[PDB]
Amino acid sequence: LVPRGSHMPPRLQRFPATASADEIFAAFQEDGCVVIEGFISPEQVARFSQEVDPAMEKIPVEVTNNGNSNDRTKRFSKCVIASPTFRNEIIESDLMHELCDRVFSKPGEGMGYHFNDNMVIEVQPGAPAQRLHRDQELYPWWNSMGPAGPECVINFFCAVTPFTEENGATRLVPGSHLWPEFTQINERDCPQFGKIETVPAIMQPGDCYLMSGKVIHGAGHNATTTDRRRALALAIIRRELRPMQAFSLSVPMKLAREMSERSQTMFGFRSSVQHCDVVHFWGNDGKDIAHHLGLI
Amino acid sequence: GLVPRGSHMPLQRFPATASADEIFAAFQEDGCVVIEGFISPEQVARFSQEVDPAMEKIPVEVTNNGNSNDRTKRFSKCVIASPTFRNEIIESDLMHELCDRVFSKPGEGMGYHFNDNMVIEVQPGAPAQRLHRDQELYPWWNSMGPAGPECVINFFCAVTPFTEENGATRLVPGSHLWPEFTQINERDCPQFGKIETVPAIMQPGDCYLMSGKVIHGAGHNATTTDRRRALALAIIRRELRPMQAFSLSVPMKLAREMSERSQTMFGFRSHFWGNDGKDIAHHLGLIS
Ligand SMILES: O=C(O)CCC(=O)C(=O)O
Ligand SMILES: O=C(O)CCC(=O)C(=O)O
Ligand SMILES: [Fe+3]
Ligand SMILES: [Fe+3]
Secondary structure, three states: OOOOOOOOOOOOOEEEOOOOHHHHHHHHHHHOEEEEEOOOOHHHHHHHHHHHHHHHHHOOOOOOOOHHHOOOEEEEOOHHHHOHHHHHOHHHOHHHHHHHHHHHOOOOOOOOEEEEEEEEEEEOOOOOOOOOEOHHHHOOOHHHHHHHOOOOEEEEEEEOOOEOOOOOOOEEOOOHHHOOOOOOOOOOOOOOOOOOOOEEOOEOOOOEEEEEOOOOEEOOOOOOOOOOEEEEEEEEEEOOEOOOEOHHHHOOHHHHHOOOHHHHHHHOOOOEEOOOOOOEEOEEOOEOHHHHHOOO | OOOOOOOOOOOOEEEOOOOHHHHHHHHHHHOEEEEEOOOOHHHHHHHHHHHHHHHHOOOOEOOOOOOOOEOEEEEOOHHHHOHHHHHOHHHOHHHHHHHHHHHOOOOOOOOEEEEEEEEEEEOOOOOOOOOEOHHHHOOOHHHHHHHOOOOEEEEEEEOOOEOOOOOOEEEOOOOOOOOOOOOOOOOOOOOOOOOOOEEOOEOOOOEEEEEOOOOEEEOOOOOOOOOEEEEEEEEEEOOEOOOEOHHHHOOHHHHHOOOHHHHHHHOOOOOOOEEOOEOHHHHHOOOO
């Protein structure tokens, strides 16, 4: 695309949502991130945006006097409550669960993952760029295991409205999941500070990128005047890690009863069973918590 | 003069009235430490009585299969079953004092919450448990070695007395400072078979605070009638998932009677475990 002799920026691989999960996972392993085009259908993504739009209108845009604050970005996590399309269809992506199993699920131990968050992230016009970071920084000890550590968290980060370089599409650093040392990206700790090359995740509505918690990234500057850049972050963690949202305590049981068993597991309405040499996480005295809740 | 001069020397003891800094210093040195009278004598007796009808309804497995349920009863509904547990035992200021030093960072509130409230009662004849570190439950933790942060700690309280014969836990002090944290088996542990233990001999109300990095295991209960009953207060970093879904099983009535700090321990109160920017205690009806 660029004239010969031009520097070539890093490559984000792209696959259709009809590609095999093995093909997409291979790219995720090589680079730490990969675009899945059509992850959500344009009709599903439009119904979702319409369904969460009243709640987004009620959230005020926060403007502050520190640019390093990551302001002018609306954030909304009650996707299940607000959106039938989200809870009936979006969280039922088999391709999403196929990839989560290839990341998180251990032999004969059931689902190895659950939801960390379901966040609509709408970056307002003029919002400053977000600091470069790894998402596993949320679990502060994880970087110390280096690239040899297991996965903490992954994110299916979906374009709800278009992602462009101008409106603040996430800037990603492919291959940063393989750097020898994982530090915070600051002047004191990161030798490459200020010299780190990123690439934007350009996406159409319904596209998503799957991104390892080991990948350096940061929301871009929204340099536009009118583009509210809407995203949906499906953040998925190991079953042994604590979620950012107490979904089982805020999502009503009426909606829990309508969930598939794997979706109840995702939100903590149903337990999981790990094997330690010769134990339930999130259980109830040896039983699945789903018994006590009436979920059978 | 603690062992005969010339002999090989083979676990410090403090009273609950001692300072948390003194108990924590020994905890840092050895990875475990006894706190005598951690729960008052009348409290542990009320507790034991209060959970005895729960324990009598637990059938005993006689399996010879080598897992931790072979002739060992385990029960986790201590808040539901015991007023003494939820009203007094969990409201120990020292427990929180020590939890703050293990887990909390300045300006960030409580850095810890409950993993489990488990009554463990080793039945007569139960084989000894496998040697393990409690942080094996979070399976990547050993890979960080002794430089890694603290994962889980356990206030392991004697409910009936612990003897060398009825199955008192065998501890390996200082195993939190070994250079490699491995599984403790013949295949993975070069020191297997030569690992030196000390038993945790305790009266009712005593406990030992143990680090999740310390190797240990329950002993064989070679007796005929002694059901060695224990109470394990497993506490984890706030970033880690509990083994019990306490905020879904403990009724809202009892949560309303908890202090703000106990609500946080059970997840009735929230960073992590929030509700779309707000404390989950708001939606639950727990903030004034
Ligand atoms: O909004 C974006 O594009 C990035 C958001 C993000 O990376 C985060 O919130 O951790
Ligand atoms: O019962 C004991 O003495 C030890 C039990 C224990 O360590 C466990 O179940 O994790
Ligand atoms: Fe991020
Ligand atoms: Fe143990």
